[PDB]
Amino acid sequence: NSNICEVCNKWGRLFCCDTCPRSFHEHCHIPSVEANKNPWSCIFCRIKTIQERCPESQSGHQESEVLMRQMLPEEQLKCEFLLLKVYCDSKSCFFASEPYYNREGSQGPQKPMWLNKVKTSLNEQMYTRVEGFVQDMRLIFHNHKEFYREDKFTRLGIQVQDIFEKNFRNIFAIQETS
Ligand SMILES: [Zn+2]
Ligand SMILES: [Zn+2]
Ligand SMILES: [Zn+2]
Numbered sequence: 523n524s525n526i527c528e529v530c531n532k533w534g535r536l537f538c539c540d541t542c543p544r545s546f547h548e549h550c551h552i553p554s555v556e557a558n559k560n561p562w563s564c565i566f567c568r569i570k571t572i573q574e575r576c577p578e579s580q581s582g583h584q585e586s587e588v589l590m591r592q593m594l595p596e597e598q599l600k601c602e603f604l605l606l607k608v609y610c611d612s613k614s615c616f617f618a619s620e621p622y623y624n625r626e627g628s629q630g631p632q633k634p635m636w637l638n639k640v641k642t643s644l645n646e647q648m649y650t651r652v653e654g655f656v657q658d659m660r661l662i663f664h665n666h667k668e669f670y671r672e673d674k675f676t677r678l679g680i681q682v683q684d685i686f687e688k689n690f691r692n693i694f695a696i697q698e699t700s
Contacts, residue, residue: 528564529609539564552606552641565603569693572596582697589653600693601655602644607689608637608659613682617662623669631665652694659686 523538529550536545540561548555556562563571573579591597608614618637623630640658649655663686666679690696 528566529606531612537562539567541567550609552602552609553645565599565606568599569603572599580695583695585694585696588694588696589651589656591652593647593649593651593655597652598644598647601649601652604655604686604689604693605637605640605644605659607693608682608686611682611685613678613685616678617666617682621665625669628669628671631669633661633665635661635665637662656690 523536523543524545525536526533526545527536527547527550528544529546532547534547537548537551537555538545541563544564544566546555546564552565593601609618614637620636620639621634623634635658640655640662643649643658644655660683663679663683667676670676670679691698
């Protein structure tokens with residue numbers, strides 16, 4: 523196994539996957555690394571199994587159909603994995619915890635949103651469809667773009683949204699387009 527957390531790239535108290543060489547901090551893995559379970563298989567491995575069990579699941583899909591899916595166990599897992607892929611980028615630090623808004627010339631968003639709030643919402647099974655998770659994730663970056671206006675810091679929202687969107691298209695096998 524690797525000697526650093528796959529998510530935050532630091533050492534520490536690491537749980538090792540039994541079926542691949544990745545390792546994780548307890549609360550860096552999503553869901554949080556399970557108490558017992560020997561062997562234990564990481565989210566990466568669980569996602570790869572879904573694909574291997576249903577190879578056709580990799581055929582292209584329309585985004586509108588994916589969004590309307592109910593949050594059955596496989597879709598719950600796919601959203602958890604997508605969330606984890608965003609935390610894998612170090613720039614997610616800006617979006618992880620609860621924001622506050624006091625900048626001359628700007629007003630805070632009407633509906634603040636942040637990664638740890640989406641993480642709790644997934645853990646608490648608050649989303650009934652994929653659409654609820656995706657809308658909160660896109661709202662994080664939209665709020666950031668609107669608040670920061672012409673400040674160059676706006677770019678951090680574009681960057682992390684691009685990580686989200688690329689991983690959304692990969693994990694949910696969205697049909698490739700020009
Ligand atoms: Zn970590
Ligand atoms: Zn694994
Ligand atoms: Zn099948």
